[PDB]
């Protein structure tokens, strides 16, 4: 169970599922993989957006960049431990 | 450039280049961002590990049950942008 290889292992399990009676599972796994990649991509865009808006803008002082960096850490730390209670349609 | 896959690499590089003492508080704050982001990634990968070990590698579950659990997990992720998620909530 090495965390950095968890998706690799799932990919390899997918590759091994070739029997017709396992095909609905294989398609469901393909959907997990797609949605997981989208989660990772969105997470990376969170870094890209911070990097652009805060760190590359050479009109912001080091002090302002620091403040913005501290606020994003604070926010992400809260998000990290937040618990879902509901979702809303559309 | 903004190749998304390289976002953390570029952040790490910016951190490495912030070496003047008047930039040090910004350097420390960026290192905190990097730690917190890597922890987010690590928990996400544990979500897959937990699924793999508890659903897929459990030989006592039928294919039907494994399919249902697989669909469930992706649906939850799919709904996360419309989710109400409360920080520091009551136990
Ligand atoms: Cl995430
Ligand atoms: K998340």
From Swiss-Prot, chain A:
Residues 1-59 form the L27 domain. It is found in: Cytoplasm; Cell membrane; Basolateral cell membrane; Cytoplasm, Cytoskeleton. During the cellular blastoderm stage, isoform B, isoform F, isoform H, isoform I and isoform L expression is localized to the cell borders. From stage 11 onwards, expression is found predominantly in the developing nervous system: axon bundles in the ventral cord and the brain. Stage 14 and 15 embryos exhibit expression in the developing body wall muscle. Expression in neuropil regions of the CNS and at NMJs persists through to larval development. Other isoforms show expression in embryonic epithelial cells. Belongs to the MAGUK family. During embryonic development, some isoforms are essential for proper neuronal differentiation and organization. Required for cell polarity; maintenance of apicobasal polarity. Plays a critical role at septate junctions in cellular growth control during larval development. The presence of a guanylate kinase domain suggests involvement in cellular adhesion as well as signal transduction to control cellular proliferation. This is Disks large 1 tumor suppressor protein. It comes from Drosophila melanogaster.
């Amino acid at each position: 169970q090495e965390a950095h290889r968890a998706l690799e292992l799932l990919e390899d399990y997918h590759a091994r599922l070739s029997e017709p009676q396992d095909r609905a599972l294989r398609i469901a796994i393909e959907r997990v993989i797609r949605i997981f990649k989208s989660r990772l991509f969105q997470a990376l865009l969170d870094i890209q957006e911070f990097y652009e808006l805060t760190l590359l803008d050479d009109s912001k002082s080091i002090q302002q960049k620091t403040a913005e960096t501290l606020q994003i850490a604070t926010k992400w730390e809260k998000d990290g431990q937040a618990v879902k209670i509901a979702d809303f349609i559309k």
